[PDB]
Subunit: 380 residues, 4 copies
Amino acid sequence: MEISQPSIGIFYISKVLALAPYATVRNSKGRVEIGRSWLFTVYSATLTVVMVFLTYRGLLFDANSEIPVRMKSATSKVVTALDVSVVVMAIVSGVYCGLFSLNDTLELNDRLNKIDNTLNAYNNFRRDRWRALGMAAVSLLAISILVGLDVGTWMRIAQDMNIAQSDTELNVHWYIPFYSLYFILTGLQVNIANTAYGLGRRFGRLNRMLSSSFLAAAAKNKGLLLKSLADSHESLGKCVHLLSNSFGIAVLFILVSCLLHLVATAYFLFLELLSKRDNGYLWVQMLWICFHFLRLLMVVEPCHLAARESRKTIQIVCEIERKVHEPILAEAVKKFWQQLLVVDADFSACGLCRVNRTILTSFASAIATYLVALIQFQRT
Amino acid sequence: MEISQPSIGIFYISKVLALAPYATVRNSKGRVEIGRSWLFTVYSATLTVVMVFLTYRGLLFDANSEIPVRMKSATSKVVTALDVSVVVMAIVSGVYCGLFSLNDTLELNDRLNKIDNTLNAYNNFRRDRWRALGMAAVSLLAISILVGLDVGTWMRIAQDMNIAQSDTELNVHWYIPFYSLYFILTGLQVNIANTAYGLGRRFGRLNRMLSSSFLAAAAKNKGLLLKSLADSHESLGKCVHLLSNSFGIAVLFILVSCLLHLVATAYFLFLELLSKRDNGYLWVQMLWICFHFLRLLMVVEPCHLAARESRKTIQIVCEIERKVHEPILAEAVKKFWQQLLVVDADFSACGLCRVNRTILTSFASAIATYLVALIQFQRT
Amino acid sequence: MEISQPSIGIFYISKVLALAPYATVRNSKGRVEIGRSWLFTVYSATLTVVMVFLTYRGLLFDANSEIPVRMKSATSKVVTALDVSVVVMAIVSGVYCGLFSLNDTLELNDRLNKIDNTLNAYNNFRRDRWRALGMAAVSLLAISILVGLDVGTWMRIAQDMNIAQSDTELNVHWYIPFYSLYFILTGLQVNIANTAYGLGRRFGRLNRMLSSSFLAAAAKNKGLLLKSLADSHESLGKCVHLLSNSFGIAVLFILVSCLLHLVATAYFLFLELLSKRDNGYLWVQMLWICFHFLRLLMVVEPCHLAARESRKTIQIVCEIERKVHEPILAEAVKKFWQQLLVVDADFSACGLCRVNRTILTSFASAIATYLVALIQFQRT
Amino acid sequence: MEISQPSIGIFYISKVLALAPYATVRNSKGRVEIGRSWLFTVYSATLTVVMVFLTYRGLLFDANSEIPVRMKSATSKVVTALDVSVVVMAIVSGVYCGLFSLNDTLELNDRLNKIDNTLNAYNNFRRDRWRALGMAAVSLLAISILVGLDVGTWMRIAQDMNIAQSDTELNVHWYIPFYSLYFILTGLQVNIANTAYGLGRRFGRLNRMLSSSFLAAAAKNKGLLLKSLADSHESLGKCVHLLSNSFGIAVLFILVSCLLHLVATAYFLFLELLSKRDNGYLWVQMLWICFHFLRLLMVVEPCHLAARESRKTIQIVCEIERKVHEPILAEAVKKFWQQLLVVDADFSACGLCRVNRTILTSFASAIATYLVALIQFQRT
């Protein structure tokens, strides 16, 4: 997990959302030290347990209410329970990752500090800060707007089904912890995306530096510069492995949540389209499909970008080999090419799957198969 | 995207079909310069928007007509809407690719000019021109014939269902923009196939030159020739990457269109075969299956051929290593083998999938699964 | 396609079955020359066309008879037509491969002669001849027995359904060309399996020779021996590619036939088990499942064995590197290791799929999916 | 198969469970010699045949009883028969593997003795013994508890359905051989997991030794130490191949058993949940799901761990290359890197599939697909 000064806003958002239980004090040199915050550690554990219990308490209350709002039919009960369960597993995995990844966070940030020093010619504090804040603001605004629309639509649905001998508005009011869990999930995805995007961006900066220093006395300094670039590439690969080892189960549960959410929400959209009972509900479900697809991209694209940027470095080095003539420089380029021969670039979610754009194709095939099967389920 | 003098006819076809908004003036040396044509740029954007709007306007008109011809049943409505949607996405992606790939087109054609100069012993202007014109003519003739047959069959179907209190012929007449979109899709596929086939053909010419110059004073010239061949192979690989980066989303949407078209048309053929209501409709649907399979091959085969031709070069170089004895020549062959160790050969459609003949197996499995599921859908 | 003196019996079986239209005259040196036999070329083409036409004529006759025996229900009609179609495509592809693979056959046999000369210490004429004749005899005996059982069972079924106003025995008698096509398919599979098994066996002999000559004046001869082994390995890989290029579509259609046959026969076995109408039919269908699984193994196992044997050579060479000290010998082993780094070992069926034991897992998954879907089809 | 002094308890458990028919006498040096035990060889074969026959005899008795307990409905009959069949195939494959893997067991233990001598600094007799005994005790306790719960639940179900004119308790009493087969399966899985975990643990110890001796006169000894580490890594890879060649079909049938068990038990849990007839049965089925998932992990995780540990050695060696300067030491590290370039690390179950955590994803997808299809089967 990355905590830098440009992206300190994302870290604060994750910290208040029980995902980054670390206390950071900025040094006079601009470097950010990281240490365990036991106050926020117990706060994160307590908040996760309490709000997960509250979310399931509201689920049971809706199921045991006089007039259920969401847990009405057996199919609706199973779909709603699964919808809550995937969010709960994703946020719990994210909090667990944040609690037990302090050492890997320290190693990742130390390596990133060294890499940033190496690539100081391509650092942009303003652009990085605005990109990080923009991504966090857009994600939080999107989830806030969709939560407001969803709660309003469900409040209207509850009012329509309301009977004078029971209250249905409180049933919608008891789903507030579920939407707060959605906020925690959004913060966790923003934090993971920020770290993975930073790794891919630094890989791209390394490739740009290689091409700008080797394809567009002095030879000793140039060889030292190439040695620094090779060390930075190896360190960036280790950083990718650190992020995978720390948040692999979180990414895996995010992917599972995205798959189940897309299938279930599309199935509900088909049911409402067949019934044609409400139009605003259809638009809200379409927005939910967009949100789930966007967060799937937000977890998939950064890993694919990092892998691609890290895998084109060997082609750049091959060109450098075809262009180098100096003995010590050619030996250094040979060492770099040998290192790049066996680099493990792809992001792995605990070894279950490799996180790249191929996951999108697998997700699309699985969504189509399960959706069609559910249609046959409904007709029968 | 390739624009050469032998294949200038395909470029003109793509230009009038809103896919190649580039102005090319032939030099006195025979080289074709390429520049943005703002007249054809705005023409391509305007034509795409206008005819897409007209196609969907005709779709809505058919759905809102007194007697619908194609949008009759809910299953028919969904299938017809999806049939129009995949064509619209494919042609829009192709036009978008053609609008924002001028720089990559310039780089690809510059590299191809250098490669053609290197392999001038294997260039055949007459054969290349006739192959390109033949492929374009066959594709345009096939789509023209199938459009005429489809509109005639649908006109007959509309006449059979016609009632004196409504007009059904105009419903078929409003599907003309959809068939024009089919023409644009055919032109886009011809352009992509021409570029990819040219890359694979040049890879094969490079392999032939390697085998004819190294397996069947002077040594310095021979080593320079091998250096040119190695540079040509690297440039051809970069050309494949340029084509993938420029038209990857177009190829991906073409593949999606082919998959959906094959599944939907086969499902309609099964429905008509079960009903046994019309025989000419069955033959037209069979021709549509042939056309969709042929265009799937036309987008899949060139990429597979390019990958295979580029991947056998390393075996040829290994034989050259086993046959070479000259010091400078052996060093050059060693450099070539090292370069060929890490070549990225497969064509990638935005990283979603690798375009080769394995896609055919995946398509066949997916088609069988979805088709059988649709049969169970219809029986229920 | 391999035609050697030990396996000349398999070649004669394939020749009389319209699969090997080659005229071979044995030399005084024991080498078998191969040339096109226009008499057997036109015989193969004529026999294939005639018996394919007869098989489909009998299919149409059964469908148009007063009391159909196999083409009774629409589901039965589709299953029986597909059962005939896969056999027809497989045998036609095999005959087409045999007609247009004379040059590759010549190259493969020339390479195999050189390899056999290199590995003459491990050649066993008696064992190879008895293995080839045993495989051919077992396959022909199995298909003969199953054809007799199938025709007897169908004759009994026709007699049970017989009505005095029609003849049903002639309906079974018109399926004789279909069973002859099964014989041609068995011969084609035997020929392909013999060639692929020979390639894998020679790979294993090469590995044994490497381990027995390098792991268990003189150094110059030993280096020459290693050069011969490296050339033999490269030639064996080219032989695998020759077999793939010649009979890839035949192997692909054999795999398609095996998949469709297993699914359809298992579905019919489930139908008969549900009906419990006949027990001998159930046993015959179980034998057909065994036969289709065995021929699937007969086409899959040899390719997997060849790939495994060719892929363990690099490990043997790595051990030789760790054991070699002589300068020229170490250089030769380095060249061999470099060659083995980039060997294309897996058998490819026209690039559609890689033929190994992974195909068995894919087949099992596909069979389970389609079978379960067909069960839901039948219940509905 | 591994038989060491720390893990001698697992060997004894496997020996009394007809899985390790080997007689071992401990030497005065602490080394364990292994030889065929014909008494236990015939005991293993006789016990396997007898109890398999008894399990199927009880299955037939339940099917032919007046009031069947488990083989009541046709769906129940098929599910129960498949449940018994997968266990029978798994235990039979395990016994067959144990009977015909004496030579590979000898080779594996000789190699492991050499590796343990090489890595004697990281051997922990107490920790290894307690880990092996703990894993065996936990697995046996879990299967014992679940067998007791399952037999008690089925006894209660039989008592509820009991009619005065028949006995149903004996029907449950005749399923005792099936539960004994479950015990044999648990012992076989413990033995396989112990061997695979030992291989992965030794790979990790080798990586730790490499990092502690090369990253944290004398140079000759250090080079000899690296040569020993390289030999140990190659020997560990050969040990993984020995385990795969010996117990590949056993692992494959264990995977098939796990897949079928998870699908069938989940389907029965869904049926009972829909019926809501018994709650204790639901809890027992949930425990069975946990047990099948845990044994799937117990067969999948060790292979994935071994592959990962063996695949990070090349990265460690790359760092050593970047840190080494001594000529003979650098040459030794170059040899080690060359060896690690082409290491076959993944565990293969007879080539059908590669055993790693990707199997979990494939299993999850297959389970979801078959389960949903079975739900549609039940509703229809």
